[PDB]
């Protein structure tokens, strides 16, 4: 699913 | 639309009070796309998604349906 703010820092 | 919508009737994300929760958040709430109808964005926290579930959702191509719409999608 498309998401926002789910990338590992 | 953006990060600061009221995403559902119980949405508790507010630009005047938000703080990070998920380990991937810094200054903006994590969101996920619901594929019902024309599609819409919801805050992951407002859906009560655990971090593990959110990460699995973000890593795959499966469609997501939010808590208000998933019963309709599975019917
Ligand atoms: Zn919300
Ligand atoms: Zn929905």
């Amino acid at each position: 699913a498309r998401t926002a703010q789910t990338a590992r820092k | 639309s953006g990060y600061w919508i009221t995403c559902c009737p119980t949405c508790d994300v507010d630009i005047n009070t938000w703080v990070p929760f998920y380990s991937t958040e810094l200054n903006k709430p994590a969101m996920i796309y619901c594929s019902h109808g024309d599609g819409h964005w919801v805050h992951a926290q407002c859906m009560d998604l655990a971090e593990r579930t959110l990460i699995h959702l973000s890593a795959g191509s499966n469609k997501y349906y939010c808590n208000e719409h998933v019963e309709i999608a599975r019917a």
Side-chain angles (χ1 to χ4, degrees), chain A residues 1-7, chain B:
Chain A
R2 299 166 71 208
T3 63
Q5 307 301 316
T6 54
Chain B
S1 268
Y3 287 103
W4 307 112
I5 62 173
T6 298
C7 76
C8 82
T10 61
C11 176
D12 72 320
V13 168
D14 197 293
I15 194 171
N16 297 295
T17 66
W18 180 87
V19 300
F21 179 66
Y22 299 107
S23 77
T24 57
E25 290 173 326
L26 183 63
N27 299 305
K28 293 168 171 74
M31 298 191 82
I32 187 167
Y33 190 72
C34 172
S35 290
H36 177 75
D38 287 310
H40 68 118
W41 289 91
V42 296
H43 303 112
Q45 198 178 8
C46 296
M47 298 304 96
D48 304 317
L49 285 165
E51 173 155 319
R52 175 187 306 281
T53 314
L54 174 59
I55 294 323
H56 300 166
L57 283 160
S58 74
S61 41
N62 290 336
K63 282 174 180 243
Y64 173 75
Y65 299 96
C66 76
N67 290 335
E68 283 176 277
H69 293 138
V70 59
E71 179 170 13
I72 309 177
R74 291 285 98 75

